[PDB]
Symmetry: C3
Subunit: 168 residues, 3 copies
């Protein structure tokens, strides 16, 4: 990278050709989106402060908002539930964020984690992988079962499929 | 119905001609919206998983989201407050869902129910009719008064008028 | 004012030429927005019931909603965090509303107030100036320090820049 490239990246999201982006969604600024991910209706992914990196096969559902003081990193195979706010945090692979949840700056969610709807995770909170987290403030309920890790897998898989239909 | 009609239904919402749908809203997939209902700014009504049925005189306020693993049924004279998430549940007639509430799959709300702002009702939760429900998790506070039922009517009634002003 | 002006004001927001309004935002009805403020992606500012007044240098972040039974007043130098609902309340100058908060009708927030993410303030609730409010229901945590008030100023200031960059 160089001066002109940094300017380009500040203005033009690097969105993989394979990514479904609903017309009503706004993907603004410095945003890298990986293979087969999907951005749903009225979502806002704005990398104008901290940049945003979204992995592969990850879904950002309707009206969800991604923004951040520091960088926001969302892994591969992640499901971001409807109207969730992922703000400057770090989300490992195979995480399902329950609809309406808010995860604030510098929080870290470990791999194969399930987050209940409407969960509020304040800044700098770390969580071990393989757990169920719920509530406000979000706390660990129990370790995840193989059946739970599966549910996580079916969710992102479903979205891979629905994503095709919304333009094929 | 037949194969061709089922295919039409997965792509074209059945929206009664009287319904007001803000331009910024997204009504997508298998969705049926009845007479004199209204869909407000940036709402998202997505019936691409469980189909969605919305009754008559029912208002879905700004940035609300209707989606579901299972079928979502919203009755008549229902007021879905700003930014609510109604997901795979059953909402009876004359219900006012407080703004920012989240009602999950298979949950069931009885007729003439008033729900406080910011309420979180998890899946399969059921409630009797004629109550004030409130909080996270949502619980019944008391039974509804005539005064409360009137307020519920005035609410949807106001939206019938406002919707017409958004057409004329 | 007169009949024709009242009718114009009910249909056409008074937006200062200086204000950045994202294309995906809806600014509807009787809304007045002051110098150097900014309305972000997919926000809805609807003054079709109570009118809305937004001061100078104030930012209404993504998917935030402004609406109200009664009048809604937002002062100057205010930061309205992502997905907040500011509903028929009175917000003083230099206030930062944490993302995902809900402030209901007739609530009154004083100058130099910091509100944590996900806070739910019900109607008629009142707070003094110089405090940190948080939770559901929102309560005062401690008075604000100079370091805190600075944070408030830097927040709206950052948005002034950002708004400019979303135009040049
Ligand atoms: Mg939109
Ligand atoms: Ni932000
Ligand atoms: Ni859903
Ligand atoms: Ni309202």
């Amino acid at each position: 990278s160089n001066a002109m490239i940094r300017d380009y990246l500040e203005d033009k999201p690097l969105i993989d050709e394979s990514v479904f982006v609903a017309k009503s969604a706004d993907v603004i600024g410095n945003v890298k989106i990986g293979k087969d991910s999907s951005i749903w209706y009225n979502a806002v992914v704005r990398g104008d402060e901290g940049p945003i990196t979204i992995g592969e096969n990850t879904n950002i559902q309707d009206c969800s908002i991604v923004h951040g003081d520091t960088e926001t990193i969302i892994g591969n195979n992640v499901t971001v539930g409807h109207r969730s706010i992922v703000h400057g945090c770090k989300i490992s692979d195979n995480v399902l964020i329950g609809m309406g949840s808010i995860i604030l700056d510098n929080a870290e969610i470990g791999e194969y984690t399930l987050i209940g709807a409407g969960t509020l995770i304040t800044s700098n909170k770390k969580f071990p992988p393989g757990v169920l987290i719920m509530g406000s403030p979000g706390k660990v309920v129990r370790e995840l079962t193989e059946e739970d890790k599966k549910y996580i897998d079916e969710s992102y898989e479903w979205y891979l499929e629905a994503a095709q239909n919304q333009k094929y």
